[PDB]
Every structure is written in C-alpha cells, then in structure tokens.
Amino acid sequence: APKKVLLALTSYNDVFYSDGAKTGVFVVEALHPFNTFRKEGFEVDFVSETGKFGWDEHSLAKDFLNGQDETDFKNKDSDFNKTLAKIKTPKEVNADDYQIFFASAGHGTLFDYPKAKDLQDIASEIYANGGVVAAVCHGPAIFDGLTDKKTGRPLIEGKSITGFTDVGETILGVDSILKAKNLATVEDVAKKYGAKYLAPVGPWDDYSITDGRLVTGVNPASAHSTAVRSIVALK
Amino acid sequence: APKKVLLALTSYNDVFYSDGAKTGVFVVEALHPFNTFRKEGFEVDFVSETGKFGWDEHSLAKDFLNGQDETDFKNKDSDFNKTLAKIKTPKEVNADDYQIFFASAGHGTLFDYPKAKDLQDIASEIYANGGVVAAVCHGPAIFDGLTDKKTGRPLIEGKSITGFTDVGETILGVDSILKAKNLATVEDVAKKYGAKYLAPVGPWDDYSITDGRLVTGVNPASAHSTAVRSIVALK
C-alpha cells in the first residue's frame, strides 16, 4: 500500500461575508497540511464533493497568505498547484490507498460537508482500516453524519475534539449570517452527537487534539500541527 | 463566600535526581498560578499534606526561574513569600471558601499526592460544590484515588486530561528512577482509571485542557494557561 493522504476540500464557493466576498477553501488549511505531508514522504490527493473548488476570499488576505505560501500559491508550476490540478471526485478515489483522511476547511464546509455522504463513507473506511481521520477549523462539519462502521454510532460520539470556536464566529461578525442560513457551528455539531468539545484558550491559538486516531485543530494557525498530529497518530 | 483558590503544593522534598538534587515544588507552578489568580482578584491559600514543603532544586535553574519571578522568589517581602509563609495543613482549611482547587507540582507530587486522602476529599467537595479542580504537570498524581462523590467513581473516569508526558520523563533521564521507586506517571494514572490522556505535540509545549470543571496542563510552560483556564471554567 502506497503512503497516501486524501486531503478533502470544500466544494462550496458562493458569496458569504457582509462585504460580498465568497467563502471557499481557506488556502493555508490546504497548503500547510500539503507541505507537512510531503516533508514526511506522503503522496497527496485532493478531493471535493463536486470535483471543483474555489478559494475563501478572506483567506487571501496578507495576514493569512504571505511569504513562501503566497509564492507557492501564485506559481502555477508549484507542486501545490500541479497536485491541485489533479483534484478528484469521491467515486474516483480508492480508500485503502490512504492512511490519513485530512479535512481542510473554510466556512464553505458548513454547507457541503454535513451532506457529503460519499466523503463520509470514505473517511469511515480509512478509519475502519486503522487509519487516521483529521479535520481542522470548520472541517468537523464532516462529522455530522459520519458513522463508525463498527459501532453504528456517530464516529465522534464519546470522542474529544476541537474545531473553530463559537466565540470566533462572533469576532468575525458572521453569527447572524450562519443563523440566517440555518448552519450549525462545530460546537453545535459536537453537542448534537455527544462529542466533548475541548476549547482553546483564545480563538486564534495553535490548538489541536489527538484522540486516538481522531485528530482535530481549531483554525488556520492550527493547520500545520493538525497535520503533524495526524502523522504521529499513525506512527 | 469569599473569592478563593486553594493552591496545593507537594510536601515531598528528598534527593531524587542522579546529580543528587532534591525534588519538591516546581517554583513557577506555584508562582505563575498565584500571580494569575491575584490579577483576577482571588485570594490564595497554600496547602500541603504536612504543612511544609521544599523547592525542586532543578526548578531553580535559570531557564525555569528568572526575571520578575526570580525577584519575587528572592524578596522575602513579596506577596508570594508572605502568602507562602501562611501555608496550611488540610484540616486547617474550609472547602466552601474555595471555588478552585489548583494542584501545583514538581516530581515530588508522585510520592505524596496519590496518598493525600485529605487533600483529595477537599478537592472532591469543591468539585461537588460547583467549583473547579485544576492540576498542572505531575499534579494529576492527585487524581489517583480522587472520587467524584456523586457517582462513586474516580473523578477522572471518562474525563479528558493532560499532564506531564512519558516522553518528557525519558528526556529528563528519570524513567529508571521512577521505576526503581515504583512510581506511576501521569499517563499511567490516566490509563489505570479510564481517563483519556490527550498529549501535547511536544513535551515542553504550553498545552492545557478544559473538560468542564476539570482543567489540566502539561508542564511548567503550561502553568499560567492552566490557571487562566481554571478561572474561565468558573466564569
């Protein structure tokens, strides 16, 4: 079996924020994990529900995308961009090729991840097969409906996770946007399915949790550590 | 009811390390929490099993004790020292005076905390009364025998905690010392009583967990955040 990570992206890419900017993939939630997996000698296949994706436009701000990350993002010849060009749909991937399922995010995930049955099945199989399921930021939206095949219960029931904070939605001024669209926060999802939500001290802190082979992180600053943890959890 | 923290110290203070240095209280595990509780307007009472204590001699190293901490430590007129002079034994304290039980550490705790029934009773009452139980570093040794009065089960059973790492004992070259003395590590204690041990990425990282009103931190770098968390958990 090849050393591989399946790196999931949101396929939602519509106008979202009060300034009219689109949500989508939070660039460094894909890029930092991609870099981390590559340093450790893993191949990375990208996947989204539709086989397409767009960038969260607020994630292009220079406090979130700068330096070598920005260079890699602008250079169409970069490994990151060439690999992204090979993005697949769920039916095109083979779950026993993968030891890690890594769910990147951005607010778009709140729209598609809960409904992404096919992606959830794949993640279940990787987990059932001894692999690691990892998610950063709003990535834990994909746990809404994700079943542990061996217990028939929600995978996160009785598990400890972190993820993007309710207080952070408020700071970003998007809570009324979320309510108007009938969306559930990561804390909403954890409570609903009997997971223990373990909060960071501050909403932007590099903070992440390893609960056996279920690995979660809070926000963009946690993307790298969430990737590192997912590798360590393998061994 | 006064706003008060009961700040527990190890009473063990014997030769421990291969260089002949004594273990004891890890100075900043007392001092940083003391400072944090004071900023938030809490009074602090120190307590140990014997009413006495000595300092972990490796915690006086300048990478662990420096700047204003060192000044406060050397100045016998400091609030820290005057309050330490008032250290009590367990029978002398009143548990409904206290909203937080904070267990400082140092390796000495592995000797006395598991056997400190009286301190465990007090912590149980504070918790039973709606308060917070917090422990940093080897502090979770005090959970070995600590019972939730309302369930009759170990307080940490089914809880998520962190604490000093097995890998850290190895880095410090004390694992054979611990074995020879038949001592259990924080990870040993968590496993024995059905707690979920949630590890930091690295053994010296500022890393801490809030599981409802049970708050834990890994090491000296986590002492401040463990204190902050304990206050936030109240509200």
The CATH number assigned to the domain holding A11 equals 3.40.50.880
> A191 is in which domain, residue-wise?
1-235
Q: Chain B: nearest CA to A124, how far in angstroms? A: 22
Distances (CA, A) of A74 to A27, A29, A88, B34, B114: 12, 16, 22, 50, 57
Of the CA atoms within 13 Å of residue A221, those in its CB half-sphere come to 9
Residues of B with CB under 8 A from a CB of A: 160, 196, 198-199, 201, 208-211, 225, 228-229, 232
Q: Give the residue among B87, B24, B29 at the shortest CA–CA distance from B223.
A: B29
Mutate to test the interface with A, among B156, B159, B160, B215 (most CBs of A within 10 A): B160
Q: Which of B198, B210, B225 sits opposite A210 (nearest CB)?
A: B198
Residues, chain B = 235
Q: Give the residue among B184, B140, B186, B141 at the shortest CA–CA distance from B165.
A: B186
Contacts of B199 (CB under 8 A, 6+ apart): A210, B162, B165
CA dist B112 and B135 (Å) reads 14
Q: Which two tokens stand for residue A213?
A: 């082979």
CA dist A22 and B105 (Å) reads 49
Contacts of B179 (CB under 8 A, 6+ apart): none
Q: Give the residue among B150, B153, B138, B136 at the shortest CA–CA distance from B195.
A: B153
Please state at what angle helix B27-39 crosses helix B67-74, rounded to 10 degrees: 100
Q: Give the residue among A168, A167, A185, A41 at the shortest CA–CA distance from A113.
A: A185
Contacts of A175 (CB under 8 A, 6+ apart): A166, A169
Note the helical H segments in chain B: 27-39, 67-74, 79-84, 109-112, 117-128, 166-171, 175-180, 186-192, 223-234
- The string of DSSP letters for A59-108 reads GGSTTTS-HHHHHHHH-TTSHHHHHHTT-B-GGG--GGG-SEEEE--STT
The residue annotated as part of the active site, out of A29, A49, A57, A169, is A169
CA dist A102 and A106 (Å) reads 14
List chain B residues with CB under 8 Å of A211: 160, 196, 198
List chain A residues with CB under 8 Å of B199: 210
Number of domains chain B is built from: 1
* Location of structure tokens 């937080």: B100
CA–CA–CA angle B213, B11, B159 (5° rounding): 25
CB B30 within 8 A of CB B130: no
Q: Give the residue among A172, A175, A170, A163 at the shortest CA–CA distance from A205.
A: A163
Find residue A25's DSSP bridge partners: A55
- The string of DSSP letters for B59-120 reads GGSTTTS-HHHHHHHH-TTSHHHHHHTT-B-GGG--GGG-SEEEE--STTHHHHGGG-HHHH
CA dist A37 and A44 (Å) reads 7
Distances (CA, A) of A110 to A133, A178, A207: 18, 9, 20
Contacts of A207 (CB under 8 A, 6+ apart): A162, A200, A201, A217, A218, A219, A222, A225
How far does CA B111 lie from the centroid of its chain? 13
Contact between chains at A201 and B211 (C-beta distance less than 8 A): no
Distances (CA, A) of B209 to A10, A206, B194: 29, 13, 17
Note the helical H segments in chain A: 27-39, 67-74, 79-84, 109-112, 117-128, 166-171, 175-180, 186-192, 223-234
Contacts of B81 (CB under 8 A, 6+ apart): B72, B73, B75
Distances (CA, A) of B91 to A116, B1, B79, B155: 58, 19, 24, 22
Contacts of A137 (CB under 8 A, 6+ apart): A26, A29, A104, A105, A106, A109, A163, A164, A217, A218, A219, A220, A222, A223
List chain B residues with CB under 8 Å of A196: 160, 211
CA dist B81 and B72 (Å) reads 8
CB B208 within 8 A of CB B216: yes
Q: Which two tokens stand for residue B52?
A: 């006495």
DSSP A195: P
DSSP H or E stretch at residue A134:
strand A132-136
Sign of torsion, CA A170 A171 A176 A177?
negative
The residue annotated as part of the active site, out of B32, B107, B138, B224, is B138
Is A138 one of the catalytic residues? Answer: yes
Contact between chains at A196 and B225 (C-beta distance less than 8 A): no
The count of other CB atoms within 10 Å of the CB of residue B169 is 22
* Location of structure tokens 């034994």: B89
Q: Chain A: nearest CA to B206, how far in angstroms? A: 10
Amino acid identity for residue A225 in this structure: S
Is B138 one of the catalytic residues? Answer: yes
Contact between chains at A198 and B160 (C-beta distance less than 8 A): yes
Q: Which two tokens stand for residue A225?
A: 């550590």
Is A70 one of the catalytic residues? Answer: no
